[PDB]
Design a protein around this ligand. Structure first.
Ligand SMILES: O=C(Nc1cccc2ccccc12)c1ccc(CN2CCC[C@H](C(=O)NCCCNc3c4c(nc5ccccc35)CCCC4)C2)cc1
Ligand SMILES: *[C@@H]1O[C@H](CO[C@@H]2O[C@@H](C)[C@@H](O)[C@@H](O)[C@@H]2O)[C@@H](O[C@@H]2O[C@H](CO)[C@@H](O)[C@H](O)[C@H]2NC(C)=O)[C@H](O)[C@H]1NC(C)=O
Ligand SMILES: *[C@@H]1O[C@H](CO[C@@H]2O[C@@H](C)[C@@H](O)[C@@H](O)[C@@H]2O)[C@@H](O[C@@H]2O[C@H](CO)[C@@H](O)[C@H](O)[C@H]2NC(C)=O)[C@H](O)[C@H]1NC(C)=O
Ligand SMILES: *[C@@H]1O[C@H](CO)[C@@H](O)[C@H](O)[C@H]1NC(C)=O
Ligand SMILES: *[C@@H]1O[C@H](CO)[C@@H](O)[C@H](O)[C@H]1NC(C)=O
Ligand SMILES: *[C@@H]1O[C@H](CO)[C@@H](O)[C@H](O)[C@H]1NC(C)=O
Ligand SMILES: *[C@@H]1O[C@H](CO)[C@@H](O)[C@H](O)[C@H]1NC(C)=O
Ligand SMILES: [Cl-]
Ligand SMILES: [Cl-]
Ligand SMILES: [Cl-]
Ligand SMILES: [Cl-]
Ligand SMILES: [Cl-]
Ligand SMILES: [Cl-]
Ligand SMILES: [Cl-]
Length: 527
């Protein structure tokens, strides 16, 4: 019976047998007043203390969200769907601490992705028990509100100021500061890490002054705020809020009366109508996301990045080899996970209309021009591979490289990786490569469990990544110093060295996607 006294009351954990040892898990600790009734759409409110023993022995409710139904019964998609009850009452977090209880352990705080519309910390691939067992760190993950319930925005209006899901995350970072020393954790050594919209979230905490004292260091997997999907404009946010109001029958003149109207709507009604607020949307559109609210985020983040207005500290940043392919089977013509998706030029052109809906003819032609200079004109997968690279370079690789250059230009150490190992257990087909989100299981050390079906080489790769991440969190340096590993060089804006992660040979390379990213970063933002 492991009981910890937090500042709001006593919580009860559970013991876990991991790798012939023990981890203590505290699953489902509340960290805010449930955002229900009059509290829906508002910022998270402080939690009033309890007097008993809160039983933190099972994952709590996931936040309300729409579910992927494109591949029913297929584990490749359904692994990302929530695995606890959906409920508005979902502001909970989890803590894994090593056994025996540590003295001043470094803390890793996970922020999941899901495009700010989906996700939950209870996913199997976010289980922080191996990190706690193997590296003696504490792992924390929290649920945060997503979609309109988390990011609906009437800027300046506190009834729906926007960015609520980010303030959920922040209130959880605060909880760690006030409480993690009781679990044996060092509040002075906190590393945020997340993937996709979670990585973008982490990058926004580097920008937000209200978060600057709540963490030490940052790790960004496949995401950053300067990605084109990561920030909703004040124009779009308002056009989307009124679109939702109209769809729900909540159109009013008093903008506050609109919110009160949306507060008598059942969560399901808000969920069904959320999808159509964006008229010409992309596959997996970020309908409701971070905005410049004037509170969490005081200016357009690109300007903050460009002008060095962010927390000075070390960053670890990286991307996967085929970030774009997962999105091609959610709308692109001729694509399918059950065949090899050989598409024609015309299919490629339609795909661009699908993924760049509001872009001019000339803009689309410019993308075609930059990506159809084939070495061989007869390789039938030419267009198929070009569409995936287009989506991956524009939405992930180039934004992440530009973040790392810009951030590093202000004097802090930065480390960039390129993950290029396709999991042997990967249920998606081979042509989709090293997909978006499929480094996460290696970061969390699932291949360390031999009872699974990972290869030995995959166990060694995960063990090395796990050590590098942990050495980065504890020491600001993502080396593996003991087993003759390749030294991870600092990423500098001139040389732009990065490290490749694979089962075979770990390599130092320079200037990832240089020719592609000059297009996306220096020409395409003009069109
Ligand atoms: O992620 C969203 N948007 C985007 C984010 C970032 C860059 C993007 C670039 C281009 C287009 C969209 C982008 C997004 C926008 C809306 C929604 C709400 N709805 C949920 C119900 C219907 C519908 C839907 O089926 N959503 C699938 C969600 C599962 N997802 C998966 C996850 C990952 N990898 C995957 C790989 C294989 C398959 C799936 C994956 C990486 C880690 C995060 C989760 C969208 C959700 C997600
Ligand atoms: C801003 O919003 C208007 C209105 O959105 C429409 O109504 C909502 C309830 C929802 O169902 C949306 O999907 C609708 O589009 C947009 O006006 C529409 O614009 C499209 C093309 O841009 C046009 O085909 C529709 O007929 C228009 N419908 C109406 C009612 O005006 C508008 O485009 C949105 N965006 C911008 C940039 O203005
Ligand atoms: C790959 O498959 C896509 C998707 O088609 C669906 O899934 C298949 C696995 C099979 O079960 C089909 O019956 C399904 O319709 C194919 O895209 C279709 O292509 C046909 C003819 O080219 C066209 O009439 C449909 O509109 C397309 N449907 C889409 C895009 O959703 C594609 O042709 C297949 N390609 C290869 C090389 O096998
Ligand atoms: C919490 O767990 C303990 C352990 O079995 C149990 O005795 C107690 O009744 C539980 N309390 C609640 C409120 O569920
Ligand atoms: C934990 O480490 C900090 C410095 O990082 C130190 O100031 C603090 O006293 C330590 N607390 C312990 C060892 O309990
Ligand atoms: C209507 O708007 C005013 C501000 O113009 C606001 O003070 C008032 O509270 C709103 N009405 C209701 C019922 O909230
Ligand atoms: C390094 O090698 C030792 C034995 O040679 C092994 O026990 C350990 O897990 C390895 N660690 C990493 C981080 O690769
Ligand atoms: Cl599960
Ligand atoms: Cl969608
Ligand atoms: Cl051709
Ligand atoms: Cl070098
Ligand atoms: Cl070079
Ligand atoms: Cl260069
Ligand atoms: Cl160019």
């Amino acid at each position: 019976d492991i009981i910890i006294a937090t500042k709001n009351g006593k919580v009860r954990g559970m013991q876990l047998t991991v790798f012939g040892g023990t981890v203590t898990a505290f699953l489902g600790i509340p960290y805010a007043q449930p955002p229900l009734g009059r509290l829906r759409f508002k910022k998270p409110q402080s939690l009033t203390k309890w007097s008993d023993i809160w039983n933190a022995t099972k994952y709590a409710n996931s936040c309300c969200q729409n579910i992927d139904q494109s591949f029913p019964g297929f584990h490749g998609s359904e692994m990302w769907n929530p695995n606890t009850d959906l409920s508005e009452d979902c502001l909970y977090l989890n803590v894994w601490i090593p056994a025996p209880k540590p003295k001043n352990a470094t803390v890793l705080i996970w922020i999941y992705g899901g495009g700010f519309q989906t996700g939950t910390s209870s996913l199997h691939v976010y289980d922080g028990k191996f990190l706690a067992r193997v590296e003696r760190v504490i792992v924390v993950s929290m649920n945060y509100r997503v979609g309109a319930l988390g990011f609906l925005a009437l800027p300046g209006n506190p009834e729906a100021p926007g960015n609520m899901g980010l303030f959920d995350q922040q209130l959880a970072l605060q909880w760690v500061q006030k409480n993690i020393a009781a679990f044996g954790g060092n509040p002075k050594s906190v590393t945020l890490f997340g993937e996709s919209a979670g990585a973008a979230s982490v990058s926004l905490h580097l920008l937000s002054p209200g978060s600057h004292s709540l963490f030490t260091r940052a790790i960004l997997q496949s995401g950053s705020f300067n990605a084109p999907w990561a920030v909703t404009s004040l124009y779009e946010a308002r056009n989307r809020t009124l679109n939702l109001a109209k769809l729900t029958g909540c159109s009013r003149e008093n903008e506050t009366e609109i919110i009160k109207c949306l507060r008598n709507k059942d969560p399901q009604e808000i969920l069904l109508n959320e999808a159509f607020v964006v008229p010409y949307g992309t596959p997996l559109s970020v309908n409701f996301g971070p905005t410049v609210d004037g509170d969490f985020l005081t200016d357009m983040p690109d300007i903050l990045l460009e002008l060095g207005q962010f927390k000075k500290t070390q960053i670890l940043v990286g991307v996967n080899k085929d970030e774009g392919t997962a999105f091609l089977v959610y709308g692109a013509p001729g694509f399918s996970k059950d065949n090899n998706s050989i598409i024609t030029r015309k299919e490629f052109q339609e795909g661009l209309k699908i993924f760049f809906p509001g872009v001019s003819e000339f803009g689309k032609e410019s993308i075609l021009f930059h990506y159809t200079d084939w070495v061989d004109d007869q390789r039938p997968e030419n267009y198929r591979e070009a569409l995936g690279d287009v989506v991956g370079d524009y939405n992930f690789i180039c934004p992440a490289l530009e973040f790392t250059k810009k951030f590093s230009e202000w004097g802090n150490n930065a480390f960039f990786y390129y993950f290029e190992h396709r999991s042997s257990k990967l249920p998606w087909p081979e042509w989709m490569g090293v997909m978006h989100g499929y480094e996460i299981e290696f970061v969390f050390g699932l291949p360390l469990e031999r009872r699974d079906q990972y290869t030995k080489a995959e166990e060694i790769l995960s063990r090395s990544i796990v050590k590098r991440w942990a050495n980065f969190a504890k020491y600001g340096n993502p080396q593996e110093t003991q087993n003759q590993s390749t030294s991870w060089p600092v990423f500098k804006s001139t040389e732009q060295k990065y490290l490749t992660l694979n089962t075979e040979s770990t390599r130092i390379m320079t200037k990832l996607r240089a020719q592609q990213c000059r297009f996306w970063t220096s020409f395409f933002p003009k069109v």
